Nucleic acid binder design. Structure first.
Lengths: 143, 99, 82, 98, 204, 60, 128
RNA sequence: AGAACCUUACCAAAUCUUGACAUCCUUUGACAACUCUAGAGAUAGAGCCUUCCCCUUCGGGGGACAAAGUGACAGGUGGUGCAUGGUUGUCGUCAGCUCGUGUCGUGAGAUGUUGGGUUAAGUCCCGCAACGAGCGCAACCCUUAAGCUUAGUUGCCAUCAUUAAGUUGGGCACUCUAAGUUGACUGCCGGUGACAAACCGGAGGAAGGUGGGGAUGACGUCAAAUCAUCAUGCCCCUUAUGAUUUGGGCUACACACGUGCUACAAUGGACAAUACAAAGGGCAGCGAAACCGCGAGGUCAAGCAAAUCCCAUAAAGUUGUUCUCAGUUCGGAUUGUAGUCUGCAACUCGACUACAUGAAGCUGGAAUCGCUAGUAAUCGUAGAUCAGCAUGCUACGGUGAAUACGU
């Protein structure tokens, strides 16, 4: 029932990188995931060069929702999120959109995504929008 | 100058107590005996299905056990020889008297 | 393949030994799976027991994209409709 | 369905008959993922004509069998079973308040 | 599952091996050597009604010791039989023997003895169940803590297969410290095959 | 049937290998071992016997 | 001088931690931790026993090691260290056990059984 | 849990009939090797050497024999898993399932096994015409996590000196190694609780709530499966429904079903350098080094029934270089060419190596499947089955996460 914590990030002394390398960690291969992510911390901290946390923390407060929905006859209820699920899903659409740019690099699509997302654009700020258009559209018949 | 042996039987009590038999009869008329230096005692595996015609997925397993015992003794003499070939029993042990 | 190299059952070859010096024959019946073509067998006929019945195959000149063990595969029409 | 016949050689006559019958169920709904038929001559020695049938359904399936004198009586008697074994299912009918 | 005689589950802990010799990889010779003896004992089964025999094989000899309830039979008066058994055996074992009968005590309590017993009263045209009635009767008599006794086949020389068992005395079976002696038998007269599966519990 | 085949795997050969090591007690050729020459199932039966040592069991 | 020492056990990977006063430095198998264990940039976590015990530090190190891969083998390091720190001072056991790392993880792999194949996947059922 | 012959049950032909083979009775006998002829072999035709070996007083007895007779017989993969035994899947590792005694009731039947709590569970406790007992769960056993002891080689090197190398000296101290120890049992405490049953929490402890898994699978349902494991009731056959040989076939394909494997690529492909396991096999088998070769393999031969020697070197990965998004160095089917091993024999029907050729295919539609942590997923390793041969099975490890609100 607990959620099997990750201790710190051993890179810049954050944490959610660790939560995030594991989401790049496909096939159980960590080093290639860690590789391409930290590389993205080179690229995004280069272009319009800045700290990791400006683009990162801002962008993941531009897409990281506050309300979601669940079904139950079938009546979709708007719901308050548990912050682990909030952050969870933010990163979910983060990587799961990161491939969906349709590009070549390991990192540009990432750093494009978090840079774009720090600027309140792209499909992750979008899914925050549309998600919160399912929230307060569906307040009525299930809250 | 030394004596050495190898034992192989399929019960862990009898084999080492038997080692105490020959070792007791050995340091009786000798000494300088290496204690029962253990050995890894590997195994085997044999898998068979609980069936006759069909039902392969539902099966059963078996194995084999294989004890080895390394025991030696130094400053040899014909008395410890008779202690070697004197009392090996029960005969499930597979003694291999060597030097 | 073979261990250096080509071979014969050493009765079939021992037969065509008697067939091949004189006025040759156009007829040999056999079973001939452990034996294969080479230029002593030329000018003769063979009929390898397919498994039900032998059938004639006359040894032609460059029968080298081909061998003795089979000439009409015993799957035999076809086995299939098409 | 592996329309196989134990100790009876499935002709095209039998296949035609069978499939023909299940066509009638397009009333509901077909939706044809698969179907099977087990038929056998089991000597009693009055000796049979056994029919066991299987229907895989949407989110579920329904088996059906029966014995009788001959194959055609077995297919007709087992009919009117795998219809009511199917009909009804649904509706189910809305709530909550509140 | 579904079930197994616990002996397979009890062995390696609470009982000797049913046949023994030194541990070398020449087993196909020596196992199928043992079996040639295991066959021949059936001639004595009709004369001895022994439970079983476990063989030892000394470094150049063989020792077997037969668990019988008929000592003077197998011993004979003065060993007029055991010695031609040595040689008719040694003839076939291609190697000698030192038989030494190990008579059964307690005495006719055992599973196998009773097993083929009731199989044979059954083979002599007997209403099956009473045989088990007298069996269990003399069973709790002799002092035993748990029994049942099962039967299968075409009982009474009649129509299709049946079964039955009379359970009495608490029988720890799903335990691992029971030390119990499962058995089996086979005997028909005219209609099929009717074996039995007796059970006991004596000590732990 | 297998009755003559009993002699087949016991008969001599033209050469080394057109042979097999079937079971002794049973005549099932397939699913056998060169260690004991026993079919799949006689081994099961006589492993329960604990005739040979044998072990059996369930330590893997 | 003096030197402390301990043993390490996890994940089919064994280590004989030899822990000595010193700068704080590693040559496992007479070879440094860093290039030896791929990649690896995780060795803060290996020095977190120093982040919590006699913090900061430092004590130099030696260890012989074999078996399993880097994960357990880098992770077989600690319990010999932390145990050698119980042997150093049991006072920090209250600072250790409240934070772990002297509790050797009893977990390991499993056995097989019927159901498994090349990929550790149990079988499907009959659809259609 | 290995169909080229064998296997093979199926087919062709060449074949035999107390027979392929077995016992009995009769006649003998140590039991037949090497070639020749034919045969496709089976096998014959012969030559030929199998040649009473233990006992024998002259003979006989006898282990074992020849071909023949001998009638029983042999044999049946001929049928009947609904004539059966045996063996095994199943719901279900669910939590239930019965009885002796007594009561009740015309009677079938109920009681116990019900009501309250509680546990994963008929787990326990309370109350109760019910009481007691059984099978069943747990437990008992195996493995695993900690320590103590016992012992130190082929195992380890801590102090050392030392070798390329624990190689040598030495030490068993360490790890390791196999057997008895101590340990976890709500056990200690705190709380909640009909104070009991219990439950929540806390301390320590290596391990707290049957630590994890393994084994064990109740009564029983499925007229479940198997006469082809073995055995067997009954029926049937018997110059064949039996048995011998060479070849075929059991694998053919317009197609479909299931199951797995491999691709559809830059999280990547091609290439160079480099780090890490577990388990287990080996006697004439494991074949070290060296040597040959594009490699499969070929030569040689050290060692070794194994803590040793060898098998056997781990892959993923790490370091770099390049490719720079093509139906591409993706891709890897296709077909041919030239070769290695085994086999008497690789054509129907063995695998593999070198060269070329480069199909479809850009994540799969409706529908649909598994999985709660070292799990999934992925990459390796060995073993059996074996002359040869596993995209399969079994076992071993390496790496290695997301989710679990609530019902």
């Amino acid at each position: 029932v607990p959620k099997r914590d990750v201790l710190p990030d051993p890179i810049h002394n954050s944490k959610l990188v660790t939560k995030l390398i594991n989401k790049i960690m496909l096939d159980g291969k960590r080093g290639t995931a860690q590789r391409i992510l930290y590389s993205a911390f080179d690229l995004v901290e280069q272009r319009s060069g800045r700290d990791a946390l400006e683009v990162f923390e801002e962008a993941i407060n531009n897409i990281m929702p506050v309300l979601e929905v669940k079904a139950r006859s079938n009546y979709q209820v708007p719901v308050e999120v548990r912050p682990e699920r909030r952050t969870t899903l933010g990163l979910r659409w983060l990587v799961n959109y990161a491939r969906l740019r349709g590009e070549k690099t390991m990192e540009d699509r990432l750093a494009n995504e978090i840079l774009d997302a720090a600027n309140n654009t792209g499909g992750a700020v979008k899914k925050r929008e549309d998600t919160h258009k399912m929230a307060e559209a569906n307040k009525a018949f299930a809250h | 100058q030394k004596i050495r042996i190898r034992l192989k039987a399929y019960d862990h009590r009898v084999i080492d107590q038997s080692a105490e038999k020959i070792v007791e009869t050995a340091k009786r008329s000798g000494a300088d005996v290496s204690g029962p230096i253990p050995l890894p005692t590997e195994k085997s595996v044999y898998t068979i299905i609980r069936a006759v015609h069909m039902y392969k997925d539902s099966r059963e397993q078996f194995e084999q056990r294989t004890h080895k015992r390394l025991i030696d003794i130094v400053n040899p003499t014909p008395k410890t020889v008779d202690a070697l070939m004197g009392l090996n029993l029960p005969s499930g042990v597979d003694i291999e008297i060597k030097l | 393949s073979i261990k250096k190299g080509p071979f014969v059952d050493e009765h079939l070859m021992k037969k065509v030994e008697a067939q091949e010096g004189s006025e040759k024959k156009q007829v040999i019946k056999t079973w001939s799976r452990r034996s294969t073509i080479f230029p002593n067998f030329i000018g003769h006929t063979f009929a390898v027991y397919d498994g039900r019945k032998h059938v004639p195959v006359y040894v032609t000149e460059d029968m080298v994209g081909h061998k003795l063990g089979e000439f009409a595969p015993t799957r035999t029409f076809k086995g299939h409709v098409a | 369905f592996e329309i196989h016949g134990d100790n009876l050689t499935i002709t095209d006559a039998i296949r035609n008959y069978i499939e023909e019958k299940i066509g009638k169920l397009e009333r509901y709904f077909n939706d044809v993922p698969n179907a099977v038929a087990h038929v056998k001559v089991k000597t009693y020695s009055n000796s049979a004509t056994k029919i066991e049938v299987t229907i895989p359904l949407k989110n579920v399936t329904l088996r059906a069998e029966e014995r009788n004198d001959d194959l055609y009586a077995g297919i007709d008697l087992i009919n009117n079973k795998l219809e009511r074994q199917v009909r009804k299912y649904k509706t189910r009918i809305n709530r909550k308040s509140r | 599952g579904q079930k197994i005689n616990p002996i397979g589950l009890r062995v390696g802990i609470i009982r000797d091996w049913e046949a023994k010799w030194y541990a070398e990889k020449d087993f196909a010779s020596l196992l199928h050597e043992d079996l040639k003896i295991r066959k021949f004992i059936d001639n004595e089964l009709k004369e001895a009604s022994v439970s079983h025999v476990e063989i030892e094989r000394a470094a150049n000899r063989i020792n077997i010791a037969i668990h019988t309830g008929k000592p003077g039979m197998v011993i004979g008066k003065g060993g007029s039989e055991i010695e031609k058994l040595r040689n008719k055996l040694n003839a076939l074992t291609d190697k000698k023997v030192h038989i030494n009968v190990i008579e059964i005590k307690k005495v006719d309590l055992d599973a196998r003895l009773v097993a083929e017993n009731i199989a044979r009263q059954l083979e002599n045209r007997a209403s099956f169940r009473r045989v088990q009635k007298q069996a269990i009767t003399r069973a709790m008599k002799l002092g035993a803590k748990g029994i049942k006794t099962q039967v299968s086949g075409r009982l009474g020389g009649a129509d299709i297969a049946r079964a039955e068992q009379y359970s009495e005395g608490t029988v720890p079976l799903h335990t691992l410290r029971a030390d119990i002696d499962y058995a089996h038998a086979e005997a028909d007269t005219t209609y099929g095959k009717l074996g039995v599966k007796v059970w006991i519990y004596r000590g732990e | 049937a297998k009755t003559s085949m009993v002699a087949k795997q016991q008969k001599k050969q033209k050469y080394a290998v057109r042979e097999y090591t079937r079971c002794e007690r049973c005549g099932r050729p397939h699913s056998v071992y060169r260690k004991f020459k026993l079919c799949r199932i006689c081994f099961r039966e006589l492993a329960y016997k604990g005739q040979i040592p044998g072990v059996r069991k369930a330590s893997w | 001088q003096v030197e402390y020492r301990g043993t390490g056990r996890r994940k089919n990977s064994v280590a004989r931690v030899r822990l000595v006063p010193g700068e704080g430095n590693i040559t496992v198998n007479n070879r440094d931790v860093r290039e030896y264990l791929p990649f690896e940039s995780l060795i803060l976590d290996l020095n977190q026993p120093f982040d919590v015990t006699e913090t900061k530090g430092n004590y130099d190190v030696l260890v012989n090691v074999h078996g399993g891969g880097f994960t357990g083998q880098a992770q077989a390091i600690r319990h010999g260290i932390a145990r050698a720190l119980l042997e150093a001072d049991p006072e920090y056991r209250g600072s250790l056990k409240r934070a772990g790392l002297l509790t050797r993880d009893p977990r390991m792999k499993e056995r097989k059984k019927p159901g498994l194949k090349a990929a550790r996947r149990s079988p499907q059922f009959s659809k259609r």
